[PDB]
Paper text:
WD40 proteins are a subfamily of propeller proteins with no intrinsic enzymatic activity, but their stable, modular architecture and versatile surface have allowed evolution to adapt them to many vital roles. By computationally reverse-engineering the duplication, fusion and diversification events in the evolutionary history of a WD40 protein, a perfectly symmetrical homologue called Tako8 was made. A different computational approach was employed to redesign Tako8 to create [name], a fourfold-symmetrical protein in which neighbouring blades carry compensating charges. Tako and Ika are the first successfully designed eight-bladed WD40-repeat proteins for which structures have been confirmed crystallographically.
The concentration of negatively charged residues reflects their high conservation in the parental template structures, so [name] was designed as a fourfold-symmetrical protein, allowing the search algorithm to identify compensating interactions between adjacent blades. [name] produced two crystal forms in space group [name], with one or three copies in the asymmetric unit. In one crystal form of [name] this axis is crystallographic, but in the other (and in the Ika4 crystals) it is noncrystallographic. In all crystal forms, the Ika proteins assemble as trimers which stack on top of each other into pillars. Unlike in the Tako8 protein, the conserved inter­actions stabilizing the crystal assembly involve hydrogen bonds between the outer rims of neighbouring molecules, while the interactions at the top face are mediated by water molecules and are not conserved. In comparison, only the alternating repeats of the Ika proteins can be superposed, in contrast to the template structure where the overlap of the individual blades is much poorer. The symmetry is also visible in the electrostatic potential map, where eightfold and fourfold symmetry can be observed for Tako8 and [name], respectively, with the exception of small differences owing to crystal-packing inter­actions; such charge symmetry is absent from the template protein. The melting/denaturation curves show that the Ika proteins are more stable than Tako8, especially under low-salt conditions.
Residue numbers in the entry: 2 to 319
Write the structure that this text describes.
Amino acid sequence: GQELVSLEGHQSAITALAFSKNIVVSGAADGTIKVWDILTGQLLRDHDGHQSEVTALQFKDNIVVSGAKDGTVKVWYIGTGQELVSLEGHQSAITALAFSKNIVVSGAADGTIKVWDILTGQLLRDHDGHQSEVTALQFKDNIVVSGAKDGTVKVWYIGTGQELVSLEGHQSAITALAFSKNIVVSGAADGTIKVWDILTGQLLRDHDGHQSEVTALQFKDNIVVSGAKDGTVKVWYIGTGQELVSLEGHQSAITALAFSKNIVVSGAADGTIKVWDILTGQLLRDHDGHQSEVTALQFKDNIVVSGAKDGTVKVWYI
């Protein structure tokens, strides 16, 4: 249960992290994107990247979509780093990326949401979306669910361009959300969690949460993992709001979360990285992973990839 490989990382803070198969894609605040080999620890290449801070990364199959602070959205081949198609991108900072099938949905800090076709790069839908910075973006089955810094949550159907239903949203900035079937679940920075009906719009469940000022959220099935500034990492049920397991959490602000099967990984602002099993509540591992705030976590098949504010990228084994 140690590190699998040693990666050099970046010369500036890690701001985006993606992990697929045995390849890690990392973006830094200086615009640099690096492609790593998890099996050999060597970097595949230095991507020419963006001239601005990489803000989001999407890595699916062999195609990675990267957005930056200058509004560019690039689609390129993981094997060569070569641009596959040119997207016009947004005029404001890219703040959210979603990637499903051959469609890319990008959110911006001005509230705009654009829908691209990675086959032609043509702009499919370019709506104003929100009057606030888009903070969350989930896209599945030609349905886009977006959240914003003002607490608004919207549901669009790609192609039609209009909204399917209207949701009351939250009184606080959206931190994460998810959706499937009849249910849209969203979480705001004030700890509230709201479960919506994708066709009715009714607030089916409205919980105030068990923390004040949550920083990270994660949804897997009907279970929420919430990290807060006071260091508390909590696991509770979407249906009733009852807590499902007691974890001690960190003594520093939670800045990153990861959730896969029965294992929750949390990063804190002091660099510590703890790993629990959600069933037994037992701390599988705790480590001072980085000397700086953990800013991104990726977890696939008992492998934890972590990014930090000093630019270090590390690969852990469960």
